Amino acid sequence: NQYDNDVTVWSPQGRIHQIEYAMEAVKQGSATVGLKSKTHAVLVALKRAQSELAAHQKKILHVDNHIGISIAGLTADARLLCNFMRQECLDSRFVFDRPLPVSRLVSLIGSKTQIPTQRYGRRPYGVGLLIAGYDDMGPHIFQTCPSANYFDCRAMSIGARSQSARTYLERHMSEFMECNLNELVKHGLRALRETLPAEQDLTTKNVSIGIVGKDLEFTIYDDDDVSPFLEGLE
Amino acid sequence: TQNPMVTGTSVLGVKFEGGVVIAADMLGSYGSLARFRNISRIMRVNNSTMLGASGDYADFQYLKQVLGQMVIDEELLGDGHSYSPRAIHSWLTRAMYSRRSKMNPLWNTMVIGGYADGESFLGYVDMLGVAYEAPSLATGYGAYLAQPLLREVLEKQPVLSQTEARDLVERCMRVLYYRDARSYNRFQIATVTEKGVEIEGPLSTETNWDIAHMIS
Amino acid sequence: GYDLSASTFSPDGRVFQVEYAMKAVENSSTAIGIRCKDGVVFGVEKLVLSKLYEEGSNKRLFNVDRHVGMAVAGLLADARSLADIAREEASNFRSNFGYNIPLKHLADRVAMYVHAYTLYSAVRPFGCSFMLGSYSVNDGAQLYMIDPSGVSYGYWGCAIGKARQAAKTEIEKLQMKEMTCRDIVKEVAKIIYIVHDEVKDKAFELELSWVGELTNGRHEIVPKDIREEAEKYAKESLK
Amino acid sequence: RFSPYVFNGGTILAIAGEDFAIVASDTRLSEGFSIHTRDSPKCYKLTDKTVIGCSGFHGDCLTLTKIIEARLKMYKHSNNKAMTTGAIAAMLSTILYSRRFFPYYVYNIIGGLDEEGKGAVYSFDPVGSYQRDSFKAGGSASAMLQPLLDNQVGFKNMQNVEHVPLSLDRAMRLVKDVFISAAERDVYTGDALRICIVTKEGIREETVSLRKD
Amino acid sequence: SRRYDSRTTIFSPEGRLYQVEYAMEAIGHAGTCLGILANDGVLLAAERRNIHKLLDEVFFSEKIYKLNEDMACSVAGITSDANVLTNELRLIAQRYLLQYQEPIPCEQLVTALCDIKQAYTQFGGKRPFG
Amino acid sequence: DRGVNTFSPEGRLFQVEYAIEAIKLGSTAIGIQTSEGVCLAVEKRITSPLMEPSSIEKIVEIDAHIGCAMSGLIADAKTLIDKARVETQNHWFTYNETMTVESVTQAVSNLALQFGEEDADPGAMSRPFGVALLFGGVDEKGPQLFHMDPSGTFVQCDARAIGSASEGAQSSLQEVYHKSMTLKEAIKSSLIILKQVMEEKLNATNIELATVQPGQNFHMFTKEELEEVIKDI
Amino acid sequence: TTTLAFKFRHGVIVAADSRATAGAYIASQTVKKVIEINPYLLGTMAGGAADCSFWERLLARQCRIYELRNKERISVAAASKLLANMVYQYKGMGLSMGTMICGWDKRGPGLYYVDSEGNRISGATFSVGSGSVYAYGVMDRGYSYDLEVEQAYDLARRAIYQATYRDAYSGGAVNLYHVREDGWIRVSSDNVADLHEKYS
Amino acid sequence: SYDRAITVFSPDGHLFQVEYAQEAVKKGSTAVGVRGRDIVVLGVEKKSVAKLQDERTVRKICALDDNVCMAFAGLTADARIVINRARVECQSHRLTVEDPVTVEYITRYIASLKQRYTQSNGRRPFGISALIVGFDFDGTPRLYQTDPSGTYHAWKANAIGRGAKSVREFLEKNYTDEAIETDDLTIKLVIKALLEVVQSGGKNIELAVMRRDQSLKILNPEEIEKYVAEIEKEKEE
Amino acid sequence: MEYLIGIQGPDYVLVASDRVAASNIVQMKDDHDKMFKMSEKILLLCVGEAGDTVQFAEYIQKNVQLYKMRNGYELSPTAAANFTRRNLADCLRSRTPYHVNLLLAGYDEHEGPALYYMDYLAALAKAPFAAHGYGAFLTLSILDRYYTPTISRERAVELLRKCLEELQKRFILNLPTFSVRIIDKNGIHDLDNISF
Ligand SMILES: *[B]([O])([O])[C]([C][C]([C])[C])[N]C(=O)[C][N]C(=O)C1=[C]C(Cl)=[C][C]=C1Cl
Ligand SMILES: [Cl-]
Ligand SMILES: [Cl-]
Ligand SMILES: [Cl-]
Ligand SMILES: [Cl-]
Ligand SMILES: [Cl-]
Ligand SMILES: [Cl-]
Ligand SMILES: [Cl-]
Ligand SMILES: [Cl-]
Ligand SMILES: [Cl-]
Ligand SMILES: [Cl-]
Ligand SMILES: [Cl-]
Ligand SMILES: [Cl-]
Ligand SMILES: [Cl-]
Ligand SMILES: [Cl-]
Ligand SMILES: [Cl-]
Ligand SMILES: [K+]
Ligand SMILES: [Mg+2]
Ligand SMILES: [Mg+2]
After folding, report:
1. How far apart are CA I115 and CA I78, in angstroms?
2. PTM N-acetylmethionine: at which residues (chain I)?
3. Is the CB of B76 less than 8 angstroms away from the CB of C66?
């Protein structure tokens, strides 16, 4: 109460209410899912549409040839962070002529996003990211939070009703490593489908897909390009 | 540096099957004075990469400091990624170009040798940011005296064994001792293979002075 | 109220914002360090909040210099930022003075940086405590611990986080001065298993690191097979 | 007086056809009276539709191509499409002019396909002046190549000749001939000729041997 | 820090600037000070507050300040504030003389100081001059 | 009182939520995208007959291929519009091509959360912009309409209303819209809807209408062209 | 280079050659030296090719912004002044630019000479570039405010042509434009080798 | 430097500092503007009267440049800052474009200055509205109004300050092609509009006129009370 | 190359300036005006380096006009001359010096006519007559020979004409036409150009 307006104010229970509140921005975003096999990393996102005549918000963003992200939370903060990730990747190619390792990029985000949590008048980033990448250490799915903490994941879901998607992903994760791409994307789509009201389904209007791996630069599939993946959820 | 002070002369490099060898004498010259006769002008950068430098030795020591600390910083993370020989060569290209573009160069010409993922790497970078790769390299007077011998051998036989590359480097170092007034007959040879980087020395070449009696 | 700013003393002379930050540490799971005859061993009870995470996610053991390890408890993003401060202080020391930073000096420098965040309304105290460990032939084994106020002391044994006192009471049973690192890792694993409340928190990973004569003064992860043996010794010791 | 520039040689050429573009360069990298390497081409792929040739001071060639590469990604990120040949050319003009008071010592020629699938050539001076050409030679032997191209591609100074369209197979045969002639007389041009052919199907590469002296 | 900022340069709900009004209350309690224009001159007459027996009488006045060759002022309010403003008045008048090589016209001097006072009511977060 | 960058317990920035409420004080504006072009229509909201109606400009040209309709606190829209204009001209300068509608909208949207009082320049933005914007234009994607609000969120819409009566108007848009609709039908539809929702009787001086079409540049309707369309409605 | 322009009863004629040179090397015969700033305003280029084309393109950007902000066409006076104020900051730094800004606005036909030395002047006729002295001679002996349109085209064409004949640094083609009250038009492009055939 | 955020949103979209600045305007002296056919007229109330005042020193009507002038209502010290900024800007325009400003240009400049002081750290908004009048290069007469929010519009006639509501009501019924057919009737329309709100009419109306090219004439009390009598005796009839 | 002349009589100042703008070997304009109106009774005549001359003259002009708008009355000639001086001197050792030579002519209600001379170093001198340019070398002695303090305005135009005829005869440059203006109690008057 007196402890909940400033990111510099610790509460007496050793919490920072502004960081917790910023995490609510991510829990109210639309769901997204990330998973990986031995060879590919996949992102699947639900796009929320403001009206029946609106396009559906972009949820998946290109970072570099080997890295893409999925977003939940404040879109403007997502773009600011995505721009920082882009620039760190461009810098590593410029200086070293090789892709920035995914875990090093994620450490950069952690360090960047921590700073405003400790200075008066600043605020946390109100965005959570799932990060799909491929490098010398194989495929990766990472998760970042407004607290500046980050996590290396076998699979993950964030956003609204993401708990259902996580439960699905726990249930089938022993299968993921050995899956071909098609199997892996289907698993991502089924996890995402658990987040929906019983009426409603995955369609070409509301689903977005991002894939990167051993043979495949980060690529986004929308609209008519998702139809192949949606057919034969059989 | 506007005015180089203590300097080193040629560095040689040649790729062989399974690795790369570089050579450099152990002399820091101060003008024509052979001042510091036991200095290493080669650096082990990491397990896959080595560097030889001509030109200003203090500038080399600065690069050693900076590059060494960068390799430490990367090893602290323990994350399975290391700088390749190519990445180091890129970094150096950028650093040298940048210093040139401030009109304050690092007064060096360098030879980066490495072995990574079954490929030999050999690359040049100069104080202006001129950089390239080649099957053999030679800076300074080496460009005139050593490189012709290197390239002539490499044309007749592009793939050299380790012991052939080493014999060929010794021959070039002998010629340089004969004909470069800033050379010295005390050198190091550094080799990178699958097993890592080894620096040998101090070494000397045999010399022949028979021609001293063929004037009349 | 007197507890909103690190630039405000209470009427009894306390700085409640520092004390609240300390509570963040005291809520976290337990980390231990033990100094022994030939080095320092760290152990962490790393609580696994989801089975979806990879083994190794959210490490609490860091290399801050080739000869220095760091073990943290508290808010992890603050601890990582402190690891980066420590890394930079070690790096800048080597660049300026030309040798590896002595442990005590590294501990005192980062402690002063931590302390700077306990004076002002403009910033908040770090919500973390951390241990620094090293070994060299010249300096022996050294283990320091720094808290959110910026106090720094040296220790034979140390524990931070929520089972701190239970941990310390077990650590006091060891004659650590006469033990080697190889013997101590087992005892570290044992003590983490003792103080772990298996009813209240279901799943954890043991994280182990060391620095000592046996690593040639380099801070390193304990190898997988040694860690597995240590866990098995701890688990059967729990019997 | 440290000089920040050195001349490293190199000859570039581009030709626009109806449905193709050729960008060619020799592969020698020189300095002073020496050869650095016989295998350093001067052409760089930018997109599937656009190749750039760069010669002059190699330090600046390297830097500038790296800046172009970064800026192509930046464009694609903020506009969600690859840069066109024309937009690359306009951009390069501004990158060159940013250094108006410490120039990139580089001669640039862009070859590629325009937005109707026709061959397009843009030629630049070091500080960013440019225009669209039908063909253009640049670099060390440019004065040797350009007149022959004027005559044989532009049909200049000829009477009683049908102005036919330039086929790929005649353009190729021209490109190999002019480089061979340049390698006779320009000390900097030699070793090998690298040719990139840009068409709707993609970019392909030929290489031809040149004199090594 | 937002908790401690008393917000001296903001409007109240009726469009008022309270610090300004409160400063005007301080002035109304200071020594009375009058000015009278005539055909052959102008005058200032002021109540002295410095009247204790043991005061030493060392300056030519208490509250009358010469500003330049052609101008003087008197003040009512916080004395130390008046010392700052009169010093700034003298500076302005000399900046004008430097630049134009003629004396500052009276109204231009007054306006120039008043723009400083205005600025203290609009930005900076400081108390106005009393 | 709390800072301008304070999150609520629901995870929203108070100042952004309050800026979004200020949009509801604006006049209604409508945008419709068809395969033949986009139209933008807006209620002027004349408050006195002594006011000059042509001095109310709630639709503005960004570039020849892009117009913009606004609602909310109109004075706040000026720096946004100017930024859109400068960006499209920079892009033309650098790349010798027209900037896409999406890209203009993105560039503007990157301003939205750039407010706050202890990172920034000696007097930077203290608060968000109280404005919503419809960008309507034609690029190589064809005709396009994008919406942007004070959160910085932007999105393509087939049709969209903003301002005071936007619920209401948006329902009628759901009702009348179809992907194959012509531009002339979209013009009539948007005036019929403005006519419903406006407090005042619609006429040719208290509204504005503009179009952009693949053929043709940004075009503000004249009085006479408005009068012609008003006859059917 | 040779460029020229003149005001007359029917607007303003603008002409140029098309040659670029790098020392004595002819780099192009096909340079467009007349820049279309907007449909009512032309700029000409002489001096440094990069300098002219950068700063005139920047002028075009600024004129467009001006038009968007103010809801009216920029005047020829204001356009020429924008350019003058932009280059003035750079005096002494080695910019080389000599331009004519040519339009028709509310004061009628407009013509200003602007250069990198800092000059900005209005006038009835100007020629700029290394061939300007040759162009002046012919332009001056034929010029009149009451030239018929076709006589004016003939004069501009012939003046540039004669400059291409004497001046080693001018050649290629003569490119001719006419600014009229409703906009400029491109009137012709004649190769100098074809004009030679015709003028004898 | 002081960076506090002063103007912020409140629940329901209000900008309280701007609303409070508008309250300051409402307590200012009434100002009226009418755009004639070939004249523009400003008139303003009072403000305090007072026999010992030097009348010259407190005018609320101000030249910005030879062809543009303004009246204001609200905080007079704030107005002086705006007026001097607008005067500097008129001289920049003449410098860079070599035309005098249009009335719309300078209005747009003033409005955006005002808007910036509603959206910048460390500052409160200006507590003034302005009526800005003059002629464009082509002879067209103009009347614009700005308010503390930075909004601006053109008007045929308008009032700001205390009693603006009723003065605007009067202008709405009385502003016709007839009432501005000549210079005298345009001037009389302004006086009549003031004489509705003006306490001890009048006495304390200040008035100024701008004719196409002829530059700002302030009327003297002798010239004003001529019009006052000439209107008061007409209203008997 | 540019010529300026001023002659101050008992109640007026007469000024003239050449009308050539030249570049390399060509006159590019023959009706150029080197005078800038600062106020109703003040002309600044400014020559010197290209770009610096207009930028400097117009800055001063705009600031003199601003003073009028802020204060309701005009700067006197003397105050304007000193303002001009302070700016020029203050820039002399700066990163942006202005290479300009000037005459300032004015009529003050109370001081009468004034003519001021300034060089690029910003030395300011009041003078009864003065001139700038290479042409000054051939005409100042004609002014010393024939000027008197009570010279009437008709005779000042004659004296001016003698100077301008001397440039035609003796000066190597082609300066065929001159702008002429007079300032007095009733402001600035354009006279006819003196041409050859
Ligand atoms: B003309 O002034 O003779 C002409 C006008 C331009 C617009 C073409 N100028 C030139 O040809 C001057 N040359 C160059 O600017 C130049 C410099 C360099 Cl470094 C390389 C090529 C060229 Cl074209
Ligand atoms: Cl979301
Ligand atoms: Cl959002
Ligand atoms: Cl977290
Ligand atoms: Cl979530
Ligand atoms: Cl030594
Ligand atoms: Cl080493
Ligand atoms: Cl603890
Ligand atoms: Cl004085
Ligand atoms: Cl004085
Ligand atoms: Cl809305
Ligand atoms: Cl042409
Ligand atoms: Cl503008
Ligand atoms: Cl002029
Ligand atoms: Cl401002
Ligand atoms: Cl009002
Ligand atoms: K050759
Ligand atoms: Mg040879
Ligand atoms: Mg200068």
Report:
1. 9
2. 1
3. yes
